Amino acid sequence: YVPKSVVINPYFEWDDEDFIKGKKVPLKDTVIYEVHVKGFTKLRLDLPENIRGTYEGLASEQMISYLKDLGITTVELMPVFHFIDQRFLTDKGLTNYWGYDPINFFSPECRYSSTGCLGGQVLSFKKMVNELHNAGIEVIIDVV
Amino acid sequence: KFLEFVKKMIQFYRAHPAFRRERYFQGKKLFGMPLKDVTFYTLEGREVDEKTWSSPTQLVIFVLEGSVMDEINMYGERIADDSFLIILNANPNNVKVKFPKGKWELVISSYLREIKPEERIIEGEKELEIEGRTALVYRRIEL
Amino acid sequence: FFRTRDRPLRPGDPYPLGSNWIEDDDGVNFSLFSENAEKVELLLYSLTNQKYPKEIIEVKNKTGDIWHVFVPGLRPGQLYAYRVYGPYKPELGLRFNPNKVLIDPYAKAINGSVIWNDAVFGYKIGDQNQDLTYDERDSGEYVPKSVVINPYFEWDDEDFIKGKKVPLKDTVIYEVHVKGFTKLRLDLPENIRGTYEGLASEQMISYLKDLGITTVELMPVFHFIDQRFLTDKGLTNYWGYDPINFFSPECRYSSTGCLGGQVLSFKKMVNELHNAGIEVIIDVVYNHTAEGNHLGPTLSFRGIDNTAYYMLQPDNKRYYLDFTGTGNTLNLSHPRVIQMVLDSLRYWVTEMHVDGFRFDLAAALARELYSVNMLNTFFIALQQDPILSQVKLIAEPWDVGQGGYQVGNFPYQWAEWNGKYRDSIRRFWRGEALPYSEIANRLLGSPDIYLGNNKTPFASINYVTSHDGFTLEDLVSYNQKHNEANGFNNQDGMNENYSWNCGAEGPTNDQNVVICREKQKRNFMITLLVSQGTPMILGGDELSRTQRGNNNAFCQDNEITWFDWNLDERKSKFLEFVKKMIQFYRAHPAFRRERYFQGKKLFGMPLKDVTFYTLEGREVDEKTWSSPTQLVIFVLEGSVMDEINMYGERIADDSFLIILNANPNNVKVKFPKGKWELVISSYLREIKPEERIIEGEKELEIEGRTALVYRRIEL
Amino acid sequence: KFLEFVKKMIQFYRAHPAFRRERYFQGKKLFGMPLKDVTFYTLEGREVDEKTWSSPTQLVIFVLEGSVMDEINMYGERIADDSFLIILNANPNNVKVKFPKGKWELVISSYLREIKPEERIIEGEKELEIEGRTALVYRRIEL
Amino acid sequence: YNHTAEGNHLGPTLSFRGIDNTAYYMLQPDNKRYYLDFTGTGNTLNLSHPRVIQMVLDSLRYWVTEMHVDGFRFDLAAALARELYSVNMLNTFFIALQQDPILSQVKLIAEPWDVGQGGYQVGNFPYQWAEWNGKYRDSIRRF
Ligand SMILES: *[C@@H]1O[C@H](CO)[C@@H](O[C@H]2O[C@H](C)[C@@H](N[C@H]3CC(CO)[C@@H](O)[C@H](O)[C@H]3O)[C@H](O)[C@H]2O)[C@H](O)[C@H]1O
Ligand SMILES: *[C@@H]1O[C@H](CO)[C@@H](O[C@H]2O[C@H](C)[C@@H](N[C@H]3CC(CO)[C@@H](O)[C@H](O)[C@H]3O)[C@H](O)[C@H]2O)[C@H](O)[C@H]1O
Ligand SMILES: OC[C@H]1O[C@H](O)[C@H](O)[C@@H](O)[C@@H]1O
Ligand SMILES: OC[C@H]1O[C@H](O)[C@H](O)[C@@H](O)[C@@H]1O
Ligand SMILES: OC[C@H]1O[C@H](O)[C@H](O)[C@@H](O)[C@@H]1O
Ligand SMILES: OC[C@H]1O[C@H](O)[C@H](O)[C@@H](O)[C@@H]1O
């Protein structure tokens, strides 16, 4: 019944990475944009389904362009620590949508990964941050 | 049409240092200028006093002196902006505010209606009516 | 209700000109020259909506005569265009129309083309005071938008070809139309047919590698517009010789299109070519624009700053000096225009990795006000430039204006198109008898033309055919020009085509005719590829390409100009001939020379490096040399050449004997001493077993219209 | 002593953006501020009128308004400085000068003697004796 | 760049005079045995020749990319604009220099004149060009 832990290959090429590292958004000109990875883009038929409401969906041209337009500088994602659906929510045909119930502190929630679930959640995440930084956008994660 | 409003508001915030500050406003004149970096007025035309400052209200009105700011960048330059006049009216009814000296082009508001052609400037300490639940920002273009 | 200053901005930089994705400051830097404008507006558009500005920024900073702004948040891909305000006074040259949306003359990508519409003209069209009037219809929705780009491209295998490449001296040029090349090549999947990507495909790369050419000269690939008068005829600008921007590659050749993908699609093509050991020379139009004269549209330069850019009637300044014959001529005297042209050249060199340029209507670049000057500013700057001093420069040595015939007059480092060569050689085989001189000279790299200026046979670009005029097929397939499909009542195209039908006009069945044509084709081909200098093949003549006697198919974007790859016996058996001829030229130094032949014995040898004989067996004399002829015959002494390589070795070849007979009738030539195996000819028939050697000063009969090369294997 | 002085003076130049300008002072106010970025005065308070701008002079005096300059760094920030009051008496004799309104502080002069304590701070349109061949820079601490 | 140590005629023959005398030096157009002297040092380099112009520009680029100099102050800069007999500030040399990728980024200061006739060229210099202000020098001295 309990999911299994996955050993991973931590190698990821942060192309264009390193330069944003560097006189970025100071707190003083920052404008924060609190987003739910899924809710962001679930109903965005603008993208092909199956990246709707995932990381990959969040860091797409379409979306990146939106945020760039909107004019926000940093995005604060809701909890992305792998979390569980409380039973009392399950027994009601319900789910933990917000995610504020972490079970592990190092793994990104699998239910947002387009690639899933086996190692692809962390790969899918890194690309998203990479993609964002390339666009001059900070990332702040809600942390439980 | 609101999306458009949030976009333009954000751009406003970003284009203006007098709102992205690393230091607080004190209530005084700095650098030997004849103005305050900030000033809180009453509903006519009047700097706030110890009593009006403690007593409640639904109408806030305040002036930020772009030029007399104590904001320094990382290169040791001080950092002028423009002088603004923010008029916040939460009063359910309308009110009549008296503008402080100088001349005051309109920039932004709550009004969803065609901005009356007599609201787009204010001169000479004269005054103007403001529908309840309304926010207005003004830019002094001459003092 | 905001201001131009409630939007986050920076003052930006005057340099470079154009728009620059500055990764580090997450924004774009917009630079635009104009010394006459009173105000400038940056117009930002979006993918979807292109009828109106998404946003309007006013360029408020200006260092000297250069307005500059930096908008945060803009990245690559962002569409933009320019409004320019200023004085409108067509009497004085001032033609500012801020209603007219303009293209950034420094754009490296341009979105669509122009949707033709009166509103793009900035005078009232139907008005009686044409071009004196001031039309104030917004034209945004019709003019394509400039695209900001990401210049990063990984030139894999790039850097090494950079490096002892094709010297002008062993070069063999192949003039091609990117589209026409490969439109009718079902060998590739469609949608790269007639694009860059199509040009640099395995299939094609292998073709060129086979054919044996070393460098390819692409027709104009500067983003260009279709003249309205061509549009209003259901027609197109197929050739492209009407540029509107000097930095952007034409979108109509990009497979990826059109948004940034034209320049990406181009770079890959050059990359792909270099990997195959192939140079790239682009046809370049710098002498005129697509804005034509007055009455013409207002798209780019006319709006931004008309006083510059454009040569104006100095007494009027309302009309345009036109030495190009296309309505206007670029003011190559204004510092900013000289910079733009030069930038463009450097841009296409260091950025797009071009290897050389063929300048169209060169002379137009050496114009001051009414006079030609091969020593104008522009040329001298071009000559001292560290980057450009290294690339191949080739010239159409003439413009159309008065006194614009500049053959032999271009500064060193320039090769010029030899129009003497083409005309003469064409009239020689035709049948005409020219003085033995006028042809021997041609055959020897036109020393008379170029040796008076310290140039070498390199500088002479020899060619029989070209995009201008007939094809090689239609050069032996016609006497007059059949350009009725152009829709100018056949009132365009050169009248003198120095051509001949071989006794007809158009396609034929008469075998005696076809045979003639097939012969001549090989007479031409033997010549070009045996004359000193640098030979140019017209792309397709190895396919016997036909334009149905259209000698001016500039607007024919169709089957008329399409490459036809369907090869029967005849068409293909010739392909084989061009291949073997080219290989011959390449395998033999005695034809790829850095020095001219003098007429003497060198290095203490008993022979001449060259020798011109008569019809029997006899060195030419002062009189026979000046008197006409239709039979040229000459010996090149491989061994007694003054050719040194870069390592200081002199360079033997074999001794040849070229016999050119343009005489319509047969003749009997007496072979000079020694023994003379046959190699190549015009004969389509089984080579007679008594023609395959000649000994002992004896003699042989030669059918008229026939070329023969011989190799002395014993003396 | 001179070496030292040149040092201190170069250090001053480079401290204050009002002198390392990228654009020219205009003769007028700016950014809707009362004070004008640059002003010239005469012996007495009255601003340099017309014929006084043409007629010769052995005495120059002018006030730079650091807080109302049209100066923008490469980041789109208006710069500001201090407000300074230059006195250039090239005249060989002494002269009395009337400071403009504010309250001023002595920053540097060409005086080799110790500066009298009543030159260190001028106030309220007050007057000051200026020896001939003497140059003085002043900062307005209050207004 | 404006003149050589080979003086006029009667001068020595060391370098240019000897390599090409019709190329490097502005010769009296009526004589060509005498040297046009706009510098006062015997001779004048003629930056109207394609190879002369190339050498000066080569040199400039050499000291920049090779010696990592940050800019030049040209001595008698005006004599560099003499092309024919007069100062054309629109000459080939200056134009090539303006459009040059490398020299485009460096500093270019000028002695804005020469000893020549009508050589005084204060303020007429191309942009990015700065000028030694001779009028300042004098005015301030006299003040
Ligand atoms: C060298 O440069 C030439 C001019 O740019 C090229 O010209 C060829 O293409 C031109 C568009 C064409 N223009 C004229 C056509 C006609 C009638 O035939 C008129 O109606 C137009 O107004 C003219 O502009 C030239 O005739 C044609 O030769 C040349 O191909 C390049 O190699
Ligand atoms: C600018 O350029 C000037 C000339 O190159 C410089 O000139 C200074 O040095 C020169 C060598 C000197 N030459 C003359 C001296 C005299 C008499 O004093 C004559 O006998 C010579 O024949 C002259 O050539 C100049 O007088 C001197 O000012 C200047 O310093 C540079 O800034
Ligand atoms: O004026 C234009 C003409 O100039 C020269 O005569 C060229 O040789 C010719 O080909 C061209 O058409
Ligand atoms: O003006 C054009 C003519 O100039 C010269 O006479 C050339 O020799 C000739 O070939 C050319 O057609
Ligand atoms: O001709 C050269 C002279 O020109 C001017 O008179 C300058 O003021 C002077 O300093 C310079 O030496
Ligand atoms: O002798 C020096 C003077 O020479 C000329 O007259 C100049 O025009 C002048 O500005 C300069 O002061």
Number of helices in the DSSP assignment of chain A: 4
First-to-last CA distance of chain A: 24 Å
Strand order of the largest sheet of chain A: 1-2-3
Oligomer: part of a larger assembly
Total strands of chain A: 3
Structural class computed from helices and strand pairing of chain A: alpha/beta
Based on CA atoms alone, the radius of gyration of chain A comes out at 16 Å
Helix content of chain A: 10-25%
Molecular shape of chain A? globular
Biggest beta sheet summary of chain A:
3 strands, parallel
How would you explain this protein's 3D organization?
This is part of a larger assembly, with 5 copies of chain A. By secondary structure, the first copy, chain A, is α/β, with parallel strands linked by helices. In chain A, strands 1-2-3 form a 3-stranded parallel sheet, with helices on one face. Chain A contains 4 helices and 3 strands. At the B-D interface, strand 7 of B face strand 8 of D. One alpha-D-glucopyranose binds next to loops of chain C. The PDB classes it as hydrolase. The entry lists the keywords hydrolase, glycosidase, glycosyl hydrolase. Crystal structure of Trex from Sulfolobus Solfataricus in complex with acarbose intermediate and glucose. Chains A, B, C, D, E are glycogen operon protein glgx.
